[PDB]
Design a binder for this molecule. Structure first.
Ligand code: GTP
Ligand code: GTP
Ligand code: GDP
Ligand code: MG
Ligand code: MG
Lengths: 44, 51, 428, 440, 60, 426
């Protein structure tokens, strides 16, 4: 039982790693900008 | 929080800024060429009046 | 139950507190809006240590945040967290300290002190019994150094038995920011060796070198460096927050450290700091790789053991660990290296084990070390205080501010008394 | 809530200010009506104009400027220029008759009649301020209202205000080129009243700006549009730590702690590192370390003094744009290892850095291009001692043959202030000689 | 030449891409009235270092 | 991070510059806007977003040949600030090149080179060429040698000189500057070798059928020489050797360094129909002296030191069978103390092909190097024909009138005779 708990924890670690990398790829790929941060005449 | 902690976001933001500033420098280059043409035609009008 | 009241001081003080109140708010499972969110009941049972219950089941922290310029203080209100702070506990001046210790000790900042100590009693009278306060600051500028000494010596009188910690940021020569840097941190050690129970030495040069050579990052900005390094050593007090097999809280660990009451200067460090890539290849046992740290590539201060002798060493661990492999690995490390330890103490190491690791880690460990090699930092900041004071380089922003020329010659001999006490036990 | 009043004097003060208030309006959204444009802005939430503007009940803003002249013609163009609707109509204080290149007339006879009006109007912008930091004198050294009338502000602004940090930006007369022949009389007699009465005093000759324009850029034949556009960038980069957030906020107070060794030594230099043409800007990288070693050059220092002569006393750095706080601490590694750049013996650390986020804009029709990184480097050199030794040899050739003095005597000025002012700058000139001597 | 200093019209092309201003909407709200100061009667509950309300039963 | 700087000085040097930079512009495909359609990072340096800059200098003291460079196709491929021009032409005059005119732009050139020194981290060699024939070549390069040496000392500065022929020349009082340059190249450069190349006249029509060439058809092959020397550094190989590792093996006596050999298959498409090329066979063709690029002969000389550059389909079997079979025959006289006489460098990528040149497409190629005493007879012939004009004192007044003496003229020759007395014993 203890050995299988070690295997389960390692598999949960690699799964959370895959999810984290999918998140960083999504954040890099799709981008949004807050309006208050744009120079005033540059907004439209 | 995740956006601030992240690191490849702060990597790619530089490329965003640098491509933007290259395009806007190209716009300023076209404006400078326009101003040079304006001073050329002003000189030609003074040449006409000297004649 | 055993309360801690957090103090911050300076722009460096408020970018440590905004990153320290993030790590601990992940341990106890608190939302940014301030409610409770976690899964185990073991988290919430010791929440009355750093926090305070508000109405509706909210939880707010007890932190008194200072600066003399309001520009820093707004930026904490709009961060990742920071809506959980009570808005009454923010105090700030109107005009800055001028990056001047004398301005921030006598004339510009002493108007603020009677508002800052006045919040501190309100977070003291609600307590059961305080272990003691905790101040995070920097020895660079006037809002963190001059206020930091004036805060400490105004507290240590009125609340003497309760202990005091501080987290200094000493300057470094090869990474230096201000011309006044050796002219402040020589004059404020004098007011810090008198009224502090336990001090640390966390300098920015060492935190750069472990960030390009251990963690192997590319752009270490001040948010990505303060969080992963120096806002997580302050989570050494999980003994005082979580139950363990052999535990040792913040007060039990001070008595095993200071063998004379004027030598309290430490050099911390965190044990798993591998990389983004080398986390895949290493072994999370209890090894001796970062656990024989003598090759000092992973030390959080500048100076290291090769040049001097360790007086006393700590090690506070965190994880479901075995207490044999704690102890035989205090036997590969005291004999395979042999002469860097004090001769007249045969068991220098105080250990402790607790039972909740940080998030995402099976295993973690914290190293706190005292050494006689720390006197080479205190000579070296007094070499650049003797040189500049010889020709009276930047003097006249200090003589006109109520401080005379006698208070420099006190803080040069007393700065060189600490060099004298530490050099006694160099080899003996 | 960090106000900062800028007060300009003279023909150099006005025409720098026209380039200066072109740039300030263009950073924020102030169009020359003063109303920020309506784009159905729900939030707004910008309070970055508050250092240099005041918000009215309407959409307008008013600048803090006090434009002062004794010559009515150059202040008449800002009265009927495109900025006619921006400045409050009383802030453009004019004179009644010109000063005409006399320090005596500029300080005693014709400059004293106007000044009772202006010093009321500085109160009308002082009370509106809440946490006012310090002023900005923009003045010259050649003419009467630049040399003598500014000598009379400093003797009364000091006793009326005191602990406000005054800064100035003079235009020193060149060692070789000149416009006027009477100006070395003005330039010695203005030191004795601004040695004691200006807190920190930046100072830029118009030769290296006249040189760096023809050499770094691919342009020849500039006028005062192209000089004052360059100086107007420096005044924005110093103050920009008050306007926009960054990693390390160096306000106006903390410069003078980290830059002045002794109270009689407060004359630093100034530079601007990534000045480049827009045809030229995209050819080369402008990195963090390419804009510092190309800033410690002797060819791009804005005053005609060579810093390989004296030894450096104190240095301050003001980065701007996308600058990490790492690579400013590795650029210093390249500087201090060299043998060319000597620091003084009693100053081991010798630096003061500062980072700010918002990158510079460009004015439309402006010579210098847009960048990502930019830095202004304020240094305090010993080698400024030779910018006066080149001057007082042009003052003894005046005074020992006793020429051009008959104008100055009958105004209300006696001869005793000549030989007093010559020895007074000779007291200052000896003081730079002793701090560069190594102490063993 | 003094009419150069305002002539040309600003484009959206000639602006910085970022704008990070300093907001004071939070700081002015606590500048407006003074900070907290005790003006109260002191009320601390009677604290004890170890014993909180003990029963001594079986004493005579 | 393995930088090399390249120099095109001289009218013959810019007629290399066409060729050497055409082959650098086809080793990696370089568009003339600096964006490609990390092996390039010797030469280039990426800008902010997307442009590359070559840190190579065309250093000529007349604006005419520089404006011909700018009116060439590669307008924005070469960035014009690096390239040195001078407002007043030096015109053979070492005095005007060195003292009077050059002193006002010497701070500008040093500002430029300390501006790109921040990019120059891992520099492997400042490769320099120059002709001796004028103030384009001699004086200002010489003053850069002394001032860069007193600015760093340690960095790698190398030079592969160009020399006048005995028969033909452009200027004929040019041996003054040749004697002066033989005196002044010994001081502050790590290396000075063979782009003296009179024999490329012989080679360009001997072997590749293009009679009526220019200097450019010659200077294709000078560029191909450059490719074989520095390509081992630029690309990964089996037994690659870089330029600092070159300098730590090339130089027996620290003032005695001057070899002579060629790039071996200088062969056109007409011979390339039929000649089955092998590493052994092309080096068999190469070891014949008559196809050199230094006008000298080591068949009757002593084959002292050597080096070898190999590119393409090279096998250690092939190179070692060739080494053995030509080591056997005493039709090549070998040398006394040094037994073997070969050193090897290996390149994967075969050299690129530029149109409008002499050569043709190759599967593989070989070279050699053979540092002998065969420059002793050439300097003896220059000794034979310099003294005719210094007997009766030609042209000295034009030199003298701006800031020099007859002392430098009377010192440089005796220093060259000191180098010949270094050379005569070995
Ligand atoms: N840098 C810079 N200097 C200027 C500019 N315009 C004028 N100057 C300098 O100003 C000096 C003369 O200007 P002023 O001193 O203000 O003339 P003035 O004071 O009105 O003369 P008075 O009639 O006596 O009052 C000259 O030496 C110029 O070098 C400018 O646009 N930029
Ligand atoms: N004989 C010969 N000389 C060559 C050859 N290639 C280059 N040269 C050199 O070319 C020099 C003269 O020709 P140029 O290079 O065109 O002229 P220059 O050296 O720049 O001299 P200036 O006209 O004064 O600028 C000679 O001194 C040689 O060193 C070659 O293939 N054969
Ligand atoms: N750990 C940490 N140190 C900093 C940070 N920012 C600056 N520092 C360093 O800590 C010191 C902070 O100066 P500080 O006292 O806050 O400036 P002041 O408040 O105006 O007096 C300086 O010496 C900086 O080099 C940060 O975000 N984190
Ligand atoms: Mg005037
Ligand atoms: Mg030439």
């Amino acid at each position: 039982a203890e050995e299988e708990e070690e295997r389960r924890e390692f598999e949960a670690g690699i799964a959370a790693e895959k999810s984290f990398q999918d998140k960083i790829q999504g954040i890099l790929s799709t981008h949004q900008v807050v309006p208050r941060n744009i120079h005033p005449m540059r907004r439209a | 929080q995740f956006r601030e902690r992240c690191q490849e976001l702060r990597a790619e933001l530089f490329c965003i800024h640098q491509k933007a500033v290259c395009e806007e420098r190209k716009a300023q280059i076209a404006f400078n060429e326009e101003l040079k043409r304006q001073k050329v035609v002003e000189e030609q009008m003074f040449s006409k009046l000297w004649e | 139950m055993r309360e801690i009241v957090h103090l911050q001081a300076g722009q460096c003080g408020n970018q440590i507190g905004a990153k320290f109140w993030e790590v601990i708010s992940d341990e106890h499972g608190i939302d940014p809006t301030g409610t409770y969110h976690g899964d185990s009941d073991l988290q919430l049972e010791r929440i009355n240590v750093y926090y305070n219950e508000a109405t509706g089941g909210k939880y707010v922290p007890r932190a008194v945040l200072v600066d003399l310029e309001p520009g820093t203080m707004d930026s904490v209100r709009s961060g990742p967290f920071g809506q959980i702070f009570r808005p009454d506990n923010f105090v700030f001046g109107q005009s800055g300290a001028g990056n001047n210790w004398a301005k921030g000790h006598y004339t510009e900042g002493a108007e603020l002190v009677d508002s800052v100590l006045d919040v501190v009693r309100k977070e003291a009278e609600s307590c059961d019994c305080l272990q003691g306060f905790q101040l995070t600051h920097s020895l660079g500028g006037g809002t963190g150094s001059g206020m930091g000494t004036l805060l400490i010596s105004k507290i240590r009188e009125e609340y003497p038995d309760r202990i005091m910690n501080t987290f200094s940021v000493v300057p470094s020569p090869k990474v230096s920011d201000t011309v006044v840097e050796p002219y402040n941190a020589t004059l404020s050690v004098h007011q810090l060796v008198e009224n502090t129970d336990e001090t640390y030495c966390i300098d920015n040069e060492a935190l750069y070198d472990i960030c390009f050579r251990t963690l192997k990052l590319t752009t270490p900005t001040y948010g990505d460096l303060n969080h992963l390094v120096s806002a997580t050593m302050s989570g050494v007090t999980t003994c005082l927050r979580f139950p363990g097999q052999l535990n040792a809280d913040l007060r039990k660990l001070a008595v095993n450290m200071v063998p004379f009451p004027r030598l309290h200067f430490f050099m911390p460090g965190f044990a798993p700091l591998t990389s983004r890539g080398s986390q895949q290849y290493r072994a999370l046992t209890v090894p001796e790789l970062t656990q024989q740290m003598f090759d000092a590539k992973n030390m959080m201060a500048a100076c290291d053991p090769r040049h001097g002798r360790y007086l006393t060493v700590a090690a506070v661990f965190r994880g479901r660990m075995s207490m044999k492999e704690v102890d035989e690995q205090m036997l590969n490390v005291q004999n395979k290296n042999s002469s860097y330890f004090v001769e007249w103490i045969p068991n220098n190491v105080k250990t402790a084990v607790c039972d909740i690791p940080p998030r995402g880690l099976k295993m973690s460990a914290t190293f706190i070390g005292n050494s006689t090699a720390i006197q080479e930092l205190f000579k070296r900041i007094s070499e650049q205080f003797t040189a500049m004071f010889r020709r009276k380089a930047f003097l006249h922003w200090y003589t006109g501010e109520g401080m005379d020329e006698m208070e420099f010659t006190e803080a040069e001999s007393n700065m060189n008394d600490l060099v004298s006490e530490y050099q006694q036990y160099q080899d003996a | 809530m960090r106000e900062c009043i800028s007060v300009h004097v003279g023909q150099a003060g006005v025409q720098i200010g026209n380039a200066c208030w072109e740039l300030y309006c263009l950073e924020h959204g102030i169009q020359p009506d003063g109303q920020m444009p309506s784009d159905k802005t729900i939030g707004g939430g910008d309070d970055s104009f508050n250092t240099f503007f005041s918000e009215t009940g309407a959409g307008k803003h008013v600048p803090r400027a006090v434009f002062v002249d004794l010559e009515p013609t150059v202040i008449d163009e800002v009265r009927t220029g495109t900025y006619r609707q921006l400045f409050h109509p009383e802030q453009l204080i004019t004179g009644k008759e010109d000063a005409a290149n006399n320090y005596a007339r500029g300080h005693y006879t014709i400059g004293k009649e106007l000044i009772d009006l202006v010093l009321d109007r500085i109160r009308k912008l002082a009370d509106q301020c809440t946490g006012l930091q310090g002023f900005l004198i923009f003045h010259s050294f050649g003419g009467g209202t630049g040399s003598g009338f500014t000598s009379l502000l400093m003797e009364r602004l000091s006793v009326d205000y005191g602990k406000k940090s005054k800064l100035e930006f003079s235009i020193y007369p060149a060692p070789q080129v000149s416009t006027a022949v009477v100006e070395p009389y003005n330039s010695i007699l203005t030191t004795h009243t601004t040695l004691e009465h200006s807190d920190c005093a930046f100072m830029v000759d118009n030769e290296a700006i006249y040189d760096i324009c023809r050499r770094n850029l691919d342009i020849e034949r500039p006028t005062y549009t192209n000089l004052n556009r360059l100086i107007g960038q420096i005044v924005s980069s110093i103050t920009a730590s008050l306007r926009f957030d960054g990693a390390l906020n160096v306000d106006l107070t903390e410069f003078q702690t980290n830059l002045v060794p002794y109270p009689r030594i407060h004359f630093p230099l100034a530079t601007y590192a990534p000045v480049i043409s827009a045809e030229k800007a995209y050819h080369e990288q402008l990195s963090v370390a390419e804009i510092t070693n190309a800033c410690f050059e002797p060819a791009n220092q804005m005053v005609k003094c060579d810093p390989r002569h004296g030894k450096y006393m104190a240095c301050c750095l003001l980065y701007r744009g996308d600058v990490v706080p790492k690579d400013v601490n590795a650029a210093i590694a390249t500087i201090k290892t060299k043998r060319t750049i000597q620091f003084v013996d009693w100053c081991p650390t010798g630096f003061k850095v500062g980072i700010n986020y918002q990158p510079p804009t460009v004015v439309p029709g402006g010579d210098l291009a847009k960048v990502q990184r930019a830095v202004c480097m304020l240094s305090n050199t010993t080698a400024i001692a030779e910018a006066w030794a080149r001057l007082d040899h042009k003052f003894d050739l005046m005074y020992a043959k006793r020429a051009f003095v008959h104008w100055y005597v009958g105004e209300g000025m006696e001869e005793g202030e000549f030989s007093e002012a010559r020895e007074d700058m000779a007291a200052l000139e000896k003081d730079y000689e002793e701090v560069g001597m190594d102490s063993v | 030449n003094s009419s150069n200093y305002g002539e040309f019209l600003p484009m959206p092309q000639f602006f910085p891409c970022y704008y990070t201003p300093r907001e004071q909407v939070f700081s002015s709200h606590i500048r407006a009235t003074g900070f907290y100061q005790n003006n109260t009667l002191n009320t601390a509950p009677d604290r004890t270092r170890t014993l909180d309300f003990p029963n001594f039963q079986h004493t005579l």
